[PDB]
Design a protein around this ligand. Structure first.
Ligand code: NDP
Ligand code: NDP
Lengths: 966, 966
C-alpha cells in the first residue's frame, strides 16, 4: 500500500533534474515533486497513468523539507487513504506532506481559464526575459538550475508569463510557483508550506500547450493575487501559502577583505605613460617585441599624479613576456601640492633602478609601493544619539549589538510624526522570537527592509517638547529614539515612573482590545486568562477584576500563582490552574459547574488551545492572541460554534497599518484605565542598555514575571525636561542617508548599479540619479526603477556622460535639482579586453573614459559645486590590485580611480575605491561568463557584496578590496 | 498495510458476541469495536499485543454504522498513517471511522482517577440493578444482549456504577458508553458519532479490576457530565458526542387492535358463580372430576351483573377437560336497572341450553355473547380550537396532520405567558428539515417531550386582548394558538397585514442578531450575504442597505437575481454571485480588490463555507447561521484568524432558553427597524391551513422566494377584535390532561404503571397519585418518581389499597387534596396462576381483590365524589378475551373489570377496559418470563403500547384490545 519512491539524484538516474532545484545552496525536493509522487501513487492505485488521471490536491500541508543528498538516495513513502481521500508522504517515518488527493471526476477546462488582470499592462514591450527572471530569483535566493528554469517570459508585475514544458510535471508546477513568488513585494527565500487546492487536468494541459518558433512547447501562466490563483496549462493552484525560510548562516561567502595603502619601502627602455592620448600603448607593444633588451622596461608616470599605471603593470605582468619584460613603474603620485616632485633624470632614478622593485611610487618623500593588508575585523563603532538593538546574525542572542539608526544620518521633521527619546524600552515575546530566529521578520506587518531591525514594540521616554510619554510602536522600539505618531503616545502620570510606564502600552492595549473592544467583557462574566502571570495576562486580570469578573487564570508555577495572589487579592485559590497541562480544562469545567467561561484570553497552543476551546460556555468569546495554531493553520472543530460561540483572532499589530479611530478606541480605553487606576504598571526587571543581550536571554528562559525593560536612558528628576536629547553611546556604524539629499550612481542601471541603488533606497536614499549611456533597455531595469518610483523615490535615469566635464557638470545639476548632492557612485564601466599584443590606444581611451575621465570630472564638479557631499565611491576591480590576463586598460583605469580617491581623501574630501572581486548574481561576469572559479576566486554574492560595502563606507581607508577565495 | 478484519457473527465465530449489540433491532458494529480493531492494527504495526499497547484515540469520527448481517461476513479495512498518527476504518471503500491513533508513550494512571461528583448521592441503598439498567436502556431503544449487558450496578443519577469485565474490550467500552448515556435527560436512541479522546492503558486496567463475591471481575465506572468524561478501569473517554439515531419505521410491532362489545345472537350440573366468597371454585373442581355427567356444566351468574365469568370460561376452556366440560356461562349483565332480569328457572334457560352456546349474556333483552371485532383504522378526529401541525410518521410529508394540542385539554392562565390565536404561521427551513426527518427533534433546544411536535417557529395573529401581534417562538408555532411570552411579541403596524407580519419575526430577528448584535455592522462596510433571496438573506440585505453597506449576495438562480434586483434597487449587477458553486469567492475577491468583505452572513456548507471564509477581509466578521458544518464538527483552518477575523456561531434559538435583556436587544432592533421602515415584510406564498402538507413539500423543493406561510385563520377586517378565538377545525384527537387535575394510577409503581405515569406527565399530568401496596422498593421506581418530582409533577406514592372501599375513599381523598380527580387508572394486579385443579378460592379472592373489588370501589367513590373525572381506565388482559392456560382467576377479575367499565359507560360516565396482550420491555412478563412468543403473540413494546393507549383513550368503545401476533 505504501508506494516507495527512491529519489536518486545521480547522473544516470531519471530524477537527476532534481539537482537543479537548488534553494539557498541546498538541493531540496520540490513541493511539486511531492505532488507528482502522490499523483503517481494515486494513478497506480486506480490502475491508470498520471497523464490519464486528472487529479485534485486539497489542503496540502508541507511539514518539512526533504534535502536530496549529492551521494545517496532519499526514500519517500506515499500512503493513500482512498476512503477519506487523504494522502501522506513520509520520509523515515516522519510526516513530510499531508493533504487530500483524489481523481478529478468531472474535470472542468473552464477552471483553467486565465483570470483578467486588475489593471492593463502599459509596458508590453518591457518584460522579464528568462535570464532576467532567474537573476532576480537567484538574488532572492533561488539557485534554480537549467531544468527548473522554465520561465521564459514574465511581465514586470510578475502576474503573467510563459512556462516551457519539458514533459515534466514537477518542473512545470515549480515554475508555476516561481512565477507566483516572482511578483512578490516580500524579499527573501519563500517556500510553499500550504496549498489550498491544486487541480491538474492533463487533458486540457495538452491542449493549452503551444509551440513557439523555437519548437519548444510552452504554456501561458497567470498569477492573480486578488484571487490567490496561479493558472498555467492544465494546472490550477489556489491558496498557495509560502513562508520565508531563514537563509542558512553556513554561507561559503566569507570574503577576504583587504586594504590598499601606499607602503614605504640590459639597455633600459623608458616609456612615458603620462600621455593622456594613450599613444604610448603601441610603443609599449614595441617594447614587448624584443626579448633581451626588453628586460629593463621602465614605464614612468611623471606628469600626472593620478596616472594609475599600477593596475597596468599588474595586468601586464600576467601576460606572456610581462615578467620577462620586468615592467617597472615610477609613479610620482604626490598627495599634496607642497611636496617636491622627484626628478627622474637625477640619482633617484638610478637608485630606483638599482633597487629593481617591480613598482616604485613616490608619495610626499617616501619611495614605496602599493601593498594589500588584511582589514581589521572589528566593526566600526561611532558615538551617536540614535541607535537600535539588532541581532547581527539571526537566531543568535550573542550577536546582539547597538547599530546606528536611520534617525542619526536622516533627521525627519513633519507633522503627524514625533521623535521621542527612549528612556525605557520593553521586551516582548515577539522580540524574543525575532532575536532567537523562531519568528521571521516578514511576519510582522508593515514596510520593513531586509536590513531593518524590528526589535522593540513599546517604549517610554520624552517627546520633543520634553513631556514624559509612553508609546506603542509596531517595531524599532528597542532604540535610543523612536519616530512614532502622537496617536500612539500616552502622557505618563505624575505618580508613575518611566521605568514603570514602559510596561503598559503593548500589554494593556492588547488586553483592552481583546477584552473590551473584541470580547466585549461585561461585569460579572466568568473569564479564563491563560498565562495570567505574563504581561498581557496580568493586564487582562486587572481589566476583568476592575469589572468584577470571575477570573480563572492558568500559571506555570507556584511562584507565579503566589505573585498573582499577592498582586490581585480578588483571586482566590480556585482561580488558579495549570498552563503547562490541559488539566486547566477540568479545573475550569468543575469550578464553573460544567458551563464554561464567558471569555477565554488564550495564548496557549496545540492541544492546550483545544482544551481552552472546550472551556468555553454558551455565548463564550474565545480571544486568540497566540500565533502558533494560527500560523500553522491548525484545524478548529466547528461544533464549538453550536454553542453560540464567537472566535476572535486578536492581533493588535493590525493597528499600525491603518491607525484609524479603531485604534483611538483602544487608546482611549488605556487612557481611561490610567485615570481610573485600572491600568497599573507591571513588575519590571530592568537591564541597562549596555547589556541588552542579557535581557534577551533572560526573558527567553521564561522565569520572568511581568515585563523585561531595557533602560536606554536613566530617568532624570524632572517633569518636562526641555533638553530630552538621547545621550551619546557607541553604536556600530551603519550607512544611512538623508531623505533630502540626492545620490548619483554613474552606471546605476547595471547589475551592481541596480543592486547598489536598491541598497541605497533601503538605507534612506529618496533622490536617486542613475546614469547610463543607453538608458533603460532591459525589463529588469524598468521593473526596478518603476518599483523605486512607486515606493516614493525620485529616481532619475540620466544620460549625462561623466566622461566629459560638461556631462558631469550637467549630471550634478540634475542631481542638485532634486536636492543637495550627498553621494556619487562611479560604477560606469566599458570593457575592451584582450592581451597587450592585440590592444589599441583607442581601446584604452574607451575603457578609461568612464573610469579615469569620469572620476576626474566627478571629483572636479563635486569640489566645485557639492559642499554637502558625504560619499564619493568608485568601484575598482581586484584586477587592479593583483592583475588579470588581457585587462591592462581595465587595471589602468581602476588604478587611476584609486589614485583620484586617495587624492580626494588626503584633502579631507570623501573618497572610497572598492576593489571588487568576481561579483555574483548580477553584472558583466554573470552575463558574459557563467559559481564558476574565475582567476582562483568565486563570484561574491550580492548579499555579501552589499554587507561588505556597508562595512567599507564606514572606514577611514581610501581603497579597500573584497574577494571570495575558491 | 490495510489490516483486514472479517467480522463474522456466526455461532462458532470468535466475534459471535457482537450479535448482542442490537440497537433498534439491528445488529450494529460497536464504536468500541472499531476502537479495538484499530487498536489491534496499531499493535500489529508496532509488533505488540493490544494488552501490551497503551493507546490513545483522538478526534474519533464515526461516519456511518456497520450492520452485521445474520448470515455473511462484513470486511472492515484498517489503514494506519503512523507518520500523521491517523487511522481509517473503511468498509467496501467507504470511510466508516476516522481519527488519530497512537501508542500512549507515557501512560498516566492518574488520568484514570474517578472525578468527584458535583453533589453527594443521598440514596445510596437505592441504585439501578443490571436488569433495571437494561430495562431502561431497552425502553430507550438499546436491545443489548447478555454479552453487552455489562452494567451490574448504576446510581440513579447514572453518574457512577460498575462494569463487568469479560476479557472483552469492545463490550467493556460499550458498557462505558451505555453508562454515559444512561443518565441522559434526552430520550431515544443516541449513538456515538464523535469522541474527542480515548485513553486505554491496559496496565492500569488490570489493576483497577477487582473481584466480587461472585468471582466476576468488575471495574468502577464514573460519568462526569461537567467534565464530559467517563472513566472505568483503564479506559478514559472524554468528549463523547452522541446524536439521536431516528428509530426505524420498519417496526414489526404492527398491533392487532380490536373491540369487545356485546353482540346479540347428559345430566346438567348448574353452578352459581355469583357468590362473592368464591366458594364455588372448589365446587367447580368437583364438576371437573367427572367426565360423562360433566358434559353439560352450566355456570350461571344471576345475582351480580358485573360477575365477569366470561374470562373465567375463556381460561377454563383451555384447561384439559374444559372443552369436554363444555363450560357454558349465563351472565345476567343488565346495563340498566329498568331492564327486566331474565328468570333462570323458566323456559329461557331451556332455550339457552337448547342453543348450547359456549357463552350466553343477557343485555337489556338481548341474548348474545362477547365477540372481538376489528377496530376502525380511521384516527378519531374532533372539532377543536387548539390544534398543531405534526408529522405522524417522521420523514414523511404525506403524514402531516392537525392534532389536538395541549392548550385544548389544558387552558393555562398565568402572567408572563400569553395565549395568542394564530392567523398565519410561517414555515422555516428547520421546519422542513424536521418534517422530512433530516433534523432530529432533540437538536432544537428546550424541554420537548417525545410526542411533542416542534413545527413552526414564528406566527402572527391576535393576543388575548385582540391586539394584532406577531410572535417568535422556539417551536409549536405551526398551530391554531400559541402560548408564548409577551417578550417575543411585536405589535403589527396598521399598514401591515397579518399575512405580511407572519414573515418578519424569525427572519428579521436572525438578521438583526447576526448583523447588528453579533457582526456589529457599520455603515458602508462591504458585506457578503449568502442566499440573499431567502428570508434571512433578504432581511440581512435590508439591514445592510439601510446602513448604506455594499452588498455581495449569492443567489442560486437568475430569477432570484431578478427578484433581488427588483426588491432592492440599491444592488447593482456586480452585487450578485452564485450560491450553488464556489465561484462567489472569485467574484467577491475580484470586485472587492482582493481585500474581501467586512462581514459574511453564511448559510452555505462544506467547501462553500470554506470559500466564504476565504472571502473575509482583515477584521472580517464571519457569521455562521448554517448548521451542517457546525453539527458535523468540520475543521476550520485557524490561519484565517491571522487576519484579525472574528468567527461568530450565530444561533437565534439560544434566545428562548434564557430570554434575558440580550433578547430584548434584538427585539428592540426589530421594533426600531419596523418603525423606521427598514424591516419590511417578505413575499409570502400562502397555503391555507387545510393543506399544510403541500406547503411543506412546496418549500422543500426550494423554488420559493421569501416565506411560505400557512394561513390558520383568515384575517378579519378589524384592528383589535375582542373575540380573537380560533375557529373550530377537525383535528386528530390526542390525549392531554389539565395541569390542575389529579390523576391516580392504582398499581402505578409497576412496569406498565411507571410507563403510563411517564406518558401521562408527557401529556400534561401535573398531579399524580401512584398507589402500591409495598411502596417504592426498586431503584427504577425511585429514579422515575424523583425525576417526575424534579420536573415539577406532584407525584404521591400512596399505599391506600383500592381493594377496600375505605382505602379507595382515602385514595380519592389524597388525590383531591392535590386537585380535582380527572382520571383513575387501575393497573393493580396480583397473580395466582395454576390450573383449575390446583386452584384455591383464596387465590381467586387474592387475584380479584385488586381488579374486581378495586374497580368496584374506584367506580363507587368516583361516582360519589369525583364530578370532574375524565378517565376511568382499567388494564385487562387478552387472557380475558380468548383465555390462557391456568389463569382462570385472572380472566375472571379482568372480565369483572370490563363489565364494570361497560356499566359505567352505559350511564355516560367515563369508562375504558384495555385488553393488553403480552407487554414488552416492562411488567410481569419481562420480570418473570423473558422477544419470546407467548401464546402465539409477541410482547408489545412500550412505544406501541402507549401509542395504542393514546388511540384508545379517544374512542367510544367500552372495551378494546391490543396484541401483536407472532
Ligand atoms: N562584475 C564584477 O565582477 C566586478 C565589478 N566591479 C565594479 O562593479 C561596477 C559595476 O560593474 P558590474 O558589477 O559588472 O555591474 P554592471 O557592469 O552591469 O554595471 C556597469 C554600468 O556601468 C554603465 N556605464 C558604462 N559606461 C558608462 C558611461 N560612459 N556613462 C554612464 N554609464 C556607463 C553601464 O551603463 P551604459 O553602458 O549603458 O552607459 C552599466 O550600467 C563597476 O564599477 C565595476 O568596476 C568591480 C570588479 C568586479
Ligand atoms: N405485563 C403484561 O403482559 C400485561 C399487562 N396487563 C396490564 O398491565 C397492568 C400492569 O401490569 P404489567 O404490565 O405487568 O406491569 P406491573 O405488573 O409491573 O404493574 C402492576 C402493579 O400493580 C400493583 N398492585 C398490585 N396489587 C395492588 C393493590 N392491591 N393495590 C395497589 N397496587 C397494586 C403492583 O404494586 P403492589 O403489588 O406493590 O401493590 C404493581 O405496581 C395490569 O392492570 C395488567 O392487567 C394486561 C395484560 C398483559
Amino acid at each position: 500500500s505504501a508506494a516507495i519512491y527512491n529519489i536518486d539524484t545521480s547522473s544516470e538516474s531519471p530524477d537527476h533534474y532534481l539537482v537543479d532545484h537548488t534553494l539557498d545552496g541546498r538541493v531540496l525536493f520540490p513541493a511539486t515533486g511531492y505532488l507528482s509522487i502522490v499523483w503517481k501513487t494515486l494513478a497506480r492505485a486506480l490502475g491508470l497513468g498520471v497523464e490519464q488521471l486528472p487529479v485534485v490536491f486539497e489542503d496540502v500541508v508541507l511539514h518539512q523539507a526533504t534535502i536530496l543528498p549529492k551521494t545517496g538516495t532519499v526514500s519517500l513513502e506515499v500512503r493513500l487513504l482512498e476512503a477519506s481521500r487523504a494522502f501522506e508522504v513520509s520520509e523515515n517515518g516522519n510526516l513530510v506532506v499531508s493533504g487530500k488527493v483524489y481523481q478529478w471526476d468531472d474535470p472542468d477546462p473552464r477552471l483553467f481559464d486565465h483570470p483578467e488582470s486588475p489593471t492593463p499592462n502599459p509596458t508590453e514591450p518591457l518584460f522579464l526575459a528568462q535570464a532576467e527572471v532567474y537573476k532576480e530569483l537567484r538574488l532572492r535566493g533561488y539557485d534554480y538550475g537549467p531544468h527548473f528554469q522554465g520561465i521564459l517570459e514574465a511581465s514586470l508585475e510578475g502576474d503573467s508569463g510563459r512556462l516551457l514544458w519539458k514533459d515534466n510535471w514537477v518542473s512545470f508546477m515549480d515554475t508555476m510557483l516561481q512565477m507566483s513568488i516572482l511578483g512578490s513585494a516580500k524579499h527573501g527565500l519563500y517556500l510553499p508550506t500550504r496549498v489550498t487546492a491544486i487541480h491538474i487536468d492533463p487533458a486540457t494541459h495538452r491542449q493549452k500547450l503551444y509551440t513557439l518558433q523555437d519548437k519548444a512547447q510552452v504554456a501561458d501562466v497567470v498569477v492573480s493575487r486578488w484571487l490567490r490563483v496561479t493558472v498555467a496549462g492544465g494546472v490550477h493552484i489556489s491558496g498557495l501559502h509560502t513562508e520565508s525560510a531563514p537563509r542558512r548562516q553556513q554561507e561559503q561567502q566569507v570574503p577576504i577583505l583587504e586594504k590598499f595603502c601606499f607602503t614605504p619601502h640590459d639597455s633600459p627602455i623608458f616609456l612615458p605613460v603620462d600621455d593622456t592620448s594613450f599613444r604610448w600603448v603601441e610603443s609599449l607593444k614595441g617594447i614587448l617585441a624584443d626579448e633581451d633588451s626588453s628586460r629593463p622596461v621602465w614605464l614612468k608616470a611623471i606628469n600626472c599624479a593620478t596616472s594609475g599605471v599600477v593596475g597596468l603593470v599588474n595586468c601586464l605582468r600576467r601576460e606572456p613576456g610581462g615578467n620577462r619584460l620586468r615592467c617597472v613603474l615610477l609613479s610620482n603620485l604626490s598627495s599634496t601640492s607642497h611636496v617636491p616632485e622627484v626628478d627622474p633624470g637625477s640619482a633617484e632614478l638610478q637608485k630606483v633602478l638599482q633597487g629593481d622593485l617591480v613598482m616604485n611610487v613616490y608619495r610626499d618623500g617616501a619611495w614605496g609601493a602599493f601593498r594589500h593588508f588584511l582589514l581589521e575585523e572589528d566593526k566600526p563603532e561611532e558615538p551617536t544619539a540614535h541607535a537600535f538593538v539588532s541581532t547581527l546574525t539571526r537566531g543568535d542572542l550573542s550577536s546582539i549589538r547597538w547599530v546606528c539608526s536611520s534617525l542619526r544620518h536622516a533627521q525627519p521633521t513633519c507633522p503627524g510624526a514625533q521623535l521621542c527619546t527612549v528612556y525605557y524600552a520593553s521586551l516582548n515575546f515577539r522580540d524574543i522570537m525575532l532575536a532567537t530566529g523562531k519568528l521571521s521578520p516578514d511576519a510582522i506587518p508593515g514596510k520593513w527592509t531586509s536590513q531593518d531591525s524590528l526589535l522593540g514594540m513599546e517604549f517610554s521616554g520624552r517627546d520633543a517638547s520634553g513631556k514624559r510619554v509612553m508609546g506603542l510602536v509596531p517595531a524599532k522600539g528597542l532604540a535610543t529614539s523612536v519616530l512614532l505618531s502622537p496617536d500612539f503616545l500616552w502622557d505618563v502620570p505624575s505618580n508613575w515612573t518611566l521605568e514603570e510606564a514602559a510596561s503598559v502600552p503593548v500589554v494593556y492595549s492588547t488586553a483592552y482590545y481583546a477584552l473590551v473592544v473584541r470580547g466585549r467583557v461585561r461585569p460579572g462574566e466568568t473569564l479564563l486568562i491563560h498565562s495570567g502571570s505574563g504581561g498581557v495576562g496580568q493586564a487582562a486580570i486587572a481589566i476583568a477584576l476592575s469589572l468584577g469578573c470571575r477570573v480563572f487564570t492558568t500559571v506555570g508555577s507556584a511562584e507565579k500563582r503566589a505573585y498573582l495572589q499577592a498582586r490581585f487579592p480578588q483571586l482566590d485559590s480556585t482561580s488558579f490552574a495549570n498552563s503547562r497541562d490541559t488539566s486547566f480544562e477540568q479545573h475550569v469545567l468543575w469550578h464553573t459547574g460544567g458551563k464554561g467561561v464567558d471569555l477565554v484570553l488564550n495564548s496557549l497552543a496545540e492541544e492546550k488551545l483545544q482544551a481552552s476551546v472546550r472551556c468555553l460556555a454558551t455565548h463564550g468569546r474565545f480571544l486568540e492572541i497566540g500565533k502558533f495554531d494560527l500560523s500553522q493553520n491548525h484545524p478548529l472543530g466547528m461544533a464549538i460554534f453550536l454553542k453560540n460561540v464567537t472566535f476572535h483572532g486578536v492581533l493588535l499589530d493590525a493597528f499600525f497599518n491603518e491607525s484609524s479611530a479603531d485604534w483611538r478606541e483602544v487608546w482611549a480605553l488605556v487612557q481611561a484605565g490610567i485615570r481610573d487606576g485600572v491600568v497599573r504598571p507591571l513588575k519590571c526587571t530592568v537591564f541597562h542598555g549596555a547589556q541588552v543581550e542579557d535581557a534577551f536571554r533572560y526573558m527567553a528562559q521564561g522565569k520572568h514575571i511581568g515585563k523585561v525593560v531595557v533602560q536606554v536612558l536613566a530617568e532624570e528628576p524632572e517633569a518636562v525636561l526641555k533638553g530630552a536629547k538621547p545621550k551619546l553611546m557607541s553604536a556600530i556604524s551603519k550607512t544611512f542617508c538623508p531623505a533630502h539629499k540626492s545620490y548619483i550612481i554613474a552606471g546605476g542601471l547595471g547589475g551592481f548599479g541596480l543592486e547598489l541603488a536598491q541598497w541605497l533606497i533601503q538605507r534612506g536614499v529618496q533622490k536617486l540619479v542613475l546614469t547610463s549611456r543607453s538608458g533603460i533597455r532591459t525589463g529588469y531595469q524598468a521593473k526596478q526603477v518603476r518599483r523605486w518610483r512607486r515606493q516614493g523615490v525620485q529616481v532619475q535615469v540620466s544620460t549625462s556622460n561623466i566622461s566629459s566635464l560638461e556631462g558631469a557638470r550637467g549630471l550634478i545639476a540634475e542631481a542638485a535639482q532634486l536636492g543637495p548632492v550627498g553621494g556619487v557612485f562611479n560604477l560606469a564601466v566599458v570593457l575592451r579586453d584582450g592581451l597587450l599584443e592585440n590592444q589599441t590606444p583607442e581601446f584604452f581611451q574607451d575603457v578609461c573614459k568612464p573610469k579615469y575621465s569620469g572620476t576626474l570630472n566627478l571629483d572636479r564638479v563635486t569640489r566645485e559645486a557639492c559642499p554637502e557631499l558625504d560619499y564619493f565611491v568608485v568601484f575598482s576591480s581586484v584586477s587592479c590590485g593583483r592583475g588579470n590576463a588581457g585587462q591592462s586598460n581595465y587595471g589602468f583605469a581602476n588604478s587611476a580611480m584609486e589614485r583620484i580617491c586617495e587624492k580626494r581623501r588626503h584633502e579631507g574630501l570623501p573618497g572610497l575605491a572598492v576593489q571588487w572581486g568576481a561579483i555574483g548574481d548580477v553584472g558583466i561576469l554573470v552575463e558574459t561568463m557563467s559559481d564558476t572559479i574565475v582567476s582562483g576566486t568565486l563570484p561574491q554574492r550580492m548579499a555579501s557584496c552589499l554587507e561588505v560595502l556597508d562595512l567599507f563606507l564606514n572606514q577611514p581607508h581610501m581603497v579597500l578590496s573584497s574577494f571570495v577565495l575558491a
